[PDB]
Ligand binder design. Structure first.
Ligand SMILES: Nc1ncnc2c1ncn2[C@@H]1O[C@H](COP(=O)(O)OP(=O)(O)NP(=O)(O)O)[C@@H](O)[C@H]1O
Ligand SMILES: [Mg+2]
Length: 509
RNA sequence: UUUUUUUUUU
């Protein structure tokens, strides 16, 4: 269908809460709730999207704005207005369905909706319920029945679960569906779930199959995503509201980026330790940082190291998809509040999470996808604030850095080499309590991880994979020792006839 | 010797 570009204008008139009120777009009660938050003004994306989203023109909306610039209220504000506009119609029915790629981002959006509620008790009648995995199903359904929300916030899995059983009871009058982190929800693995979600909401709608308007929001999207959303976009028009220039890099400009290039992968562990050590001394422990790692198992290992080194200076929080949902929520609650600390996580916390006044984002390794470089570093430098990022990689991961220039126009200025001293190696490795069996599982998880992104990051399989596997030897402090495996295991990997496989593993069967 | 997420507490 037709895609109307609305690119960035640098001389247009500043839209405001006051102006939107007097103009007739915003009602007094929603103006009241947002004014009480005391924001200097509305953000560029907020100014650009609120009126169009509410416009009675029959169109979908795509919107791109940078990490930290308030996309959340860019959609929650217009949604509330629509609930006010139609307050007497279908008042016990879900009118807006917000979907997100992680549970913690679903729970964050709900939280923001609750913040709108607490700034105006009048808006509480427009109830909100979150349907996400890891929580009691029955209890959430009790909440749907008792509150009869007009807004649902969800992750795909649990939403499908609920839709297949209660789409008739709550979901026949949905008017808006929002895909936050849209580009991710349309990658393989979520796209089919979204298409099921969209298909059900469309079939079950009481007005028509094309009633629902669709809102796509992300810091990383182009026209390419309008093709992928094709099967879930009903309307004949689609506004593309852009606050970033066509060629301007998507990364937030205020973030001071740098990359530290080690000779081995494992060396990035020592680089990161020395860095955090230097920040704690220099900032007198006034340091809030997020450190990303490629896998659950390596993340867990990384926490052990950082605990041993830094627990006396700072709290170290472990955040990934194998942390139970109760703890995920509570530790997100803490790191939102805390002035200082290190959150160690996978890409579960790459997108959307809003942790105020993070000083630095650190990365050991590459992200799970190219776009996520941008989102990772976007956890810092939010709402006007400053921030730095350091990417810790090895020589063999440099093609990733090049691909950032080629595919995304991201040119990291600050680069430098790193080589660990024997003392840091001793300090870190002697504190490690993991058995060689545990160390194998961790390195093996890294081989798989790096194997997945070879084509995407243009890696040399013959160089990159032996370097990751040699991490096993470095951590046990015997560089020429190889990972003990069976022939049956080597055949699952499809490397029994590969020289690359001879370099990585030793058969100890 | 489940690479990041994502129902199965329906
Ligand atoms: N108009 C505003 N002025 C100043 N701060 C704001 C405004 N709107 C929202 N914020 C705050 O900005 C922070 C980030 O907002 P958020 O909606 O998470 O940005 P975002 O575009 O969704 N970032 P991401 O999803 O990570 O790309 C939140 O803590 C809000 O409280
Ligand atoms: Mg956001």
């Amino acid at each position: 269908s037709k895609l109307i570009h609305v690119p960035k204008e640098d001389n247009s008139k500043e839209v405001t809460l006051d102006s939107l009120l007097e103009e007739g777009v915003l009602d007094k009660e929603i103006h009241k709730a947002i004014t009480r938050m005391e924001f200097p003004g509305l953000t560029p994306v907020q100014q650009k999207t609120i009126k169009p989203i509410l416009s009675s023109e029959d169109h979908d909306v795509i919107a791109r704005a940078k990490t930290g610039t308030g996309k959340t209220f860019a959609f929650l504000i217009p949604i509330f207005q629509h609930l006010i506009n139609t307050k007497f119609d279908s008042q016990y029915m879900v009118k807006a369905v917000i979907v997100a790629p992680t549970r913690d981002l679903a729970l964050q959006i709900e939280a923001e909706v609750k913040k709108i509620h607490d700034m105006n008790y009048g808006l509480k009648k427009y109830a909100c319920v979150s349907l996400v995995g890891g929580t009691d199903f029955r209890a959430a359904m009790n909440k749907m029945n008792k509150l009869r929300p007009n807004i649902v916030i969800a992750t795909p899995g649990r939403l499908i679960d609920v839709l297949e059983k209660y789409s008739n009871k709550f979901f026949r009058f949905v008017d808006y569906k929002v895909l936050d982190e849209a580009d991710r929800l349309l990658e393989i693995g979520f796209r089919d779930d979204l298409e099921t979600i969209s298909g059900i909401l469309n079939e079950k709608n009481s007005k028509s199959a094309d009633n629902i308007k669709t809102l796509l929001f992300s810091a990383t999207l182009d026209d390419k995503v309008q093709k992928l959303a094709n099967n879930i976009m009903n309307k004949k028009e689609c506004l593309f509201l852009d606050t970033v220039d066509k060629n301007e890099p998507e990364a937030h400009e205020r973030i001071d980026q740098s990359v530290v290039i080690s000779e081995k992968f494992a060396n990035s562990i020592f680089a990161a330790v020395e860095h955090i050590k230097k920040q704690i001394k220099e900032r007198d422990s006034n340091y809030k940082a997020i450190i990303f790692a490629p896998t659950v198992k390596f993340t867990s290992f990384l926490c052990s190291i950082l605990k041993n080194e830094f627990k006396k200076d700072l709290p170290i929080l472990e955040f990934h998809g194998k942390i139970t949902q109760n703890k995920r929520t509570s530790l997100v609650k803490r790191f939102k509040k805390d002035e200082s600390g290190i959150l160690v996580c996978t890409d579960v916390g790459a997108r959307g999470m809003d942790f105020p006044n993070v000083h630095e984002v650190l990365q050991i390794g590459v992200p799970s996808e190219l776009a996520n470089y941008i989102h990772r570093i976007g956890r810092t430098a939010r709402s006007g604030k400053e921030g730095s990022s350091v990417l810790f990689i090895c020589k063999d991961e440099l093609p990733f850095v090049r691909e950032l220039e080629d595919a995304k126009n991201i040119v990291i200025a600050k680069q430098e080499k790193y080589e660990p001293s024997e003392e840091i190696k001793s300090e870190v490795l002697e504190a490690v309590t993991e058995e060689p069996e545990d160390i194998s599982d961790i390195v093996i998880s890294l081989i798989s991880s790096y194997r997945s992104c070879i084509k995407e990051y243009r890696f040399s399989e013959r160089r990159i994979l032996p370097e990751i596997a040699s991490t096993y030897g470095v951590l046990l402090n015997d560089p020429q020792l190889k990972i003990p495996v069976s022939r049956r295991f080597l055949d699952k990997l499809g490397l029994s006839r590969s020289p690359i496989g001879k370099a990585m593993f030793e058969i100890r069967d």
